[PDB]
Amino acid sequence: SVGGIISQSFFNGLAGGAASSCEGKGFYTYNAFIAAANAYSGFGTTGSNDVKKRELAAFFANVMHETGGLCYINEKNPPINYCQSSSTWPCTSGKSYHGRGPLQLSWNYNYGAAGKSIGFDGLNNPEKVGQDSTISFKTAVWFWMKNSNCHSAITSGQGFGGTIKAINSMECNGGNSGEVSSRVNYYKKICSQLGVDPGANVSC
């Protein structure tokens, strides 16, 4: 029922600010988002209308931050391949697990697990996250629901700030106040566009 809260018009509003030269423009699509949202039971369909609106606002605020406003698919000039040697999620030689997609999925161990959930080979074909729109959004909803405390935070009174803590706790408590402010600014704007109060515990 996410499409009832986030319309095509609302999504185009978010995606439309990206410069035409952004790789994300026309890659990050409403069709892909709605397909991804519906794939994970409870995502933006938990709680009252205000709770659902705040969860979706929280998801999009973090997505807007991570992608520079739905501009970037790929992490810029990644310094490493993001391989942590593992017997469970072995790195494929020659592949990079740099950030890709709406929440910048990174590291072999995360790609492996995402691929297992979504139905692609995360270790051998991490590039799919930057090539298939629906897979790309599914990695973000998967991370939100299954690989982090983001969903639990936003549905247990921890507010938007709890989602920041769930995603990159190093930013909180003065770690990087500019990064927190970036995420918060997006959250407040999106809440305003959805006509929902941002709630408590907005920052961290």
Side-chain angles (χ1 to χ4, degrees):
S1 334
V2 160
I5 289 163
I6 305 290
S7 67
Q8 176 75 70
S9 175
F10 166 85
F11 188 96
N12 290 348
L14 294 185
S20 71
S21 65
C22 289
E23 54 185 358
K25 200 158 191 186
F27 176 81
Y28 293 131
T29 67
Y30 184 62
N31 307 242
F33 169 69
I34 293 299
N38 286 178
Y40 293 92
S41 180
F43 174 72
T45 61
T46 299
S48 68
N49 295 321
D50 283 352
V51 176
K52 295 182 270 196
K53 290 173 183 174
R54 288 189 278 265
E55 172 158 43
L56 291 156
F59 177 82
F60 279 109
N62 284 301
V63 165
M64 294 289 276
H65 172 77
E66 295 289 336
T67 63
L70 290 172
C71 183
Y72 301 105
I73 299 173
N74 296 291
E75 179 181 341
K76 277 301 186 207
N77 300 324
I80 52 165
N81 289 325
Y82 293 87
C83 165
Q84 182 184 288
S85 67
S86 172
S87 60
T88 301
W89 302 112
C91 307
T92 299
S93 165
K95 295 297 182 175
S96 173
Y97 306 101
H98 73 244
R100 294 180 181 87
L103 287 179
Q104 292 289 287
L105 188 72
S106 306
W107 296 97
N108 49 304
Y109 46 87
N110 291 328
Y111 275 83
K116 191 185 185 210
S117 176
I118 294 163
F120 73 104
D121 193 329
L123 300 173
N124 293 306
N125 298 312
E127 297 92 340
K128 296 219 162 180
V129 182
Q131 294 166 337
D132 186 298
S133 300
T134 296
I135 288 181
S136 201
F137 262 113
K138 283 178 177 178
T139 65
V141 179
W142 172 83
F143 175 91
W144 190 266
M145 296 296 293
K146 304 298 201 170
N147 204 234
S148 74
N149 287 332
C150 293
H151 182 250
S152 60
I154 201 60
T155 56
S156 67
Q158 293 187 40
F160 183 65
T163 75
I164 303 175
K165 195 192 167 196
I167 284 159
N168 195 19
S169 69
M170 150 186 52
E171 292 175 19
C172 299
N173 310 289
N176 193 318
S177 64
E179 283 173 351
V180 173
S181 289
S182 163
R183 298 179 190 271
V184 172
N185 191 233
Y186 274 129
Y187 179 70
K188 300 190 283 169
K189 169 175 187 154
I190 295 160
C191 284
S192 69
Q193 299 182 320
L194 290 176
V196 70
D197 185 84
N201 291 329
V202 170
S203 190
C204 70

mmCIF file of all heavy atoms in Angstrom, residues 142-152 166-167:
data_model
loop_
_atom_site.group_PDB
_atom_site.id
_atom_site.type_symbol
_atom_site.label_atom_id
_atom_site.label_comp_id
_atom_site.label_asym_id
_atom_site.label_seq_id
_atom_site.Cartn_x
_atom_site.Cartn_y
_atom_site.Cartn_z
ATOM 1 N N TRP A 142 15.763 -4.049 1.346
ATOM 2 C CA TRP A 142 16.363 -5.170 2.063
ATOM 3 C C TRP A 142 17.260 -4.683 3.197
ATOM 4 O O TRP A 142 17.163 -5.149 4.331
ATOM 5 C CB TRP A 142 17.154 -6.074 1.099
ATOM 6 C CG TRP A 142 17.940 -7.117 1.814
ATOM 7 C CD1 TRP A 142 17.482 -8.324 2.262
ATOM 8 C CD2 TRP A 142 19.321 -7.039 2.197
ATOM 9 N NE1 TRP A 142 18.497 -9.009 2.894
ATOM 10 C CE2 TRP A 142 19.631 -8.240 2.881
ATOM 11 C CE3 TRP A 142 20.323 -6.069 2.040
ATOM 12 C CZ2 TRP A 142 20.904 -8.504 3.386
ATOM 13 C CZ3 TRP A 142 21.601 -6.331 2.554
ATOM 14 C CH2 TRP A 142 21.873 -7.546 3.215
ATOM 15 N N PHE A 143 18.137 -3.723 2.912
ATOM 16 C CA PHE A 143 19.024 -3.248 3.958
ATOM 17 C C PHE A 143 18.200 -2.660 5.107
ATOM 18 O O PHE A 143 18.473 -2.911 6.277
ATOM 19 C CB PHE A 143 19.994 -2.212 3.391
ATOM 20 C CG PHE A 143 20.876 -1.584 4.426
ATOM 21 C CD1 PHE A 143 22.115 -2.135 4.722
ATOM 22 C CD2 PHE A 143 20.461 -0.443 5.108
ATOM 23 C CE1 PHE A 143 22.946 -1.549 5.705
ATOM 24 C CE2 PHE A 143 21.289 0.148 6.083
ATOM 25 C CZ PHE A 143 22.517 -0.420 6.377
ATOM 26 N N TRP A 144 17.206 -1.862 4.736
ATOM 27 C CA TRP A 144 16.342 -1.160 5.685
ATOM 28 C C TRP A 144 15.589 -2.122 6.606
ATOM 29 O O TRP A 144 15.454 -1.869 7.826
ATOM 30 C CB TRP A 144 15.352 -0.319 4.893
ATOM 31 C CG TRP A 144 14.530 0.650 5.713
ATOM 32 C CD1 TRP A 144 13.274 0.441 6.239
ATOM 33 C CD2 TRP A 144 14.908 1.971 6.090
ATOM 34 N NE1 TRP A 144 12.858 1.552 6.934
ATOM 35 C CE2 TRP A 144 13.837 2.516 6.853
ATOM 36 C CE3 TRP A 144 16.047 2.760 5.847
ATOM 37 C CZ2 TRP A 144 13.878 3.815 7.372
ATOM 38 C CZ3 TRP A 144 16.086 4.057 6.375
ATOM 39 C CH2 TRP A 144 15.000 4.570 7.125
ATOM 40 N N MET A 145 15.103 -3.223 6.016
ATOM 41 C CA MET A 145 14.203 -4.148 6.708
ATOM 42 C C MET A 145 14.909 -5.346 7.351
ATOM 43 O O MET A 145 14.486 -5.824 8.418
ATOM 44 C CB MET A 145 13.155 -4.679 5.732
ATOM 45 C CG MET A 145 12.205 -3.628 5.178
ATOM 46 S SD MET A 145 11.163 -2.845 6.419
ATOM 47 C CE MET A 145 10.105 -4.218 6.936
ATOM 48 N N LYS A 146 15.958 -5.829 6.694
ATOM 49 C CA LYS A 146 16.571 -7.134 7.013
ATOM 50 C C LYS A 146 18.033 -7.077 7.452
ATOM 51 O O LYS A 146 18.535 -8.048 8.026
ATOM 52 C CB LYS A 146 16.468 -8.073 5.808
ATOM 53 C CG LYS A 146 15.074 -8.308 5.290
ATOM 54 C CD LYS A 146 14.213 -8.959 6.329
ATOM 55 C CE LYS A 146 13.028 -9.637 5.685
ATOM 56 N NZ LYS A 146 12.312 -10.465 6.683
ATOM 57 N N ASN A 147 18.727 -5.985 7.153
ATOM 58 C CA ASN A 147 20.172 -5.917 7.413
ATOM 59 C C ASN A 147 20.573 -4.754 8.296
ATOM 60 O O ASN A 147 21.743 -4.379 8.367
ATOM 61 C CB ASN A 147 20.958 -5.868 6.092
ATOM 62 C CG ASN A 147 22.379 -6.376 6.237
ATOM 63 O OD1 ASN A 147 23.348 -5.683 5.878
ATOM 64 N ND2 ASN A 147 22.516 -7.584 6.763
ATOM 65 N N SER A 148 19.596 -4.159 8.971
ATOM 66 C CA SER A 148 19.873 -3.032 9.846
ATOM 67 C C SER A 148 18.721 -2.845 10.807
ATOM 68 O O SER A 148 17.671 -3.475 10.658
ATOM 69 C CB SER A 148 20.029 -1.743 9.036
ATOM 70 O OG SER A 148 18.766 -1.282 8.572
ATOM 71 N N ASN A 149 18.923 -1.952 11.768
ATOM 72 C CA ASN A 149 17.867 -1.572 12.699
ATOM 73 C C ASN A 149 16.991 -0.412 12.213
ATOM 74 O O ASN A 149 16.247 0.167 12.998
ATOM 75 C CB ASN A 149 18.489 -1.235 14.057
ATOM 76 C CG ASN A 149 18.976 -2.465 14.786
ATOM 77 O OD1 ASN A 149 18.442 -3.566 14.599
ATOM 78 N ND2 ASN A 149 19.985 -2.289 15.626
ATOM 79 N N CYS A 150 17.058 -0.074 10.930
ATOM 80 C CA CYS A 150 16.328 1.113 10.453
ATOM 81 C C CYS A 150 14.811 0.988 10.633
ATOM 82 O O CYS A 150 14.156 1.902 11.170
ATOM 83 C CB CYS A 150 16.640 1.393 8.985
ATOM 84 S SG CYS A 150 18.346 1.913 8.651
ATOM 85 N N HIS A 151 14.252 -0.116 10.155
ATOM 86 C CA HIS A 151 12.814 -0.343 10.296
ATOM 87 C C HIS A 151 12.399 -0.414 11.762
ATOM 88 O O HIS A 151 11.426 0.239 12.180
ATOM 89 C CB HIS A 151 12.398 -1.618 9.581
ATOM 90 C CG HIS A 151 10.930 -1.879 9.653
ATOM 91 N ND1 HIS A 151 10.384 -2.909 10.390
ATOM 92 C CD2 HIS A 151 9.887 -1.217 9.102
ATOM 93 C CE1 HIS A 151 9.069 -2.879 10.272
ATOM 94 N NE2 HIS A 151 8.740 -1.861 9.499
ATOM 95 N N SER A 152 13.150 -1.172 12.562
ATOM 96 C CA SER A 152 12.813 -1.306 13.981
ATOM 97 C C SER A 152 12.873 0.042 14.712
ATOM 98 O O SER A 152 11.984 0.358 15.521
ATOM 99 C CB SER A 152 13.698 -2.356 14.663
ATOM 100 O OG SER A 152 15.071 -2.008 14.587
ATOM 101 N N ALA A 166 21.258 3.708 12.987
ATOM 102 C CA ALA A 166 21.213 2.364 12.424
ATOM 103 C C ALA A 166 22.061 2.230 11.165
ATOM 104 O O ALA A 166 22.565 1.150 10.877
ATOM 105 C CB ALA A 166 19.781 1.965 12.130
ATOM 106 N N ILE A 167 22.196 3.331 10.422
ATOM 107 C CA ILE A 167 22.903 3.350 9.135
ATOM 108 C C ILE A 167 24.382 3.679 9.270
ATOM 109 O O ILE A 167 25.211 3.041 8.636
ATOM 110 C CB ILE A 167 22.260 4.355 8.136
ATOM 111 C CG1 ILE A 167 20.983 3.765 7.577
ATOM 112 C CG2 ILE A 167 23.247 4.716 6.982
ATOM 113 C CD1 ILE A 167 20.033 4.801 7.023
#
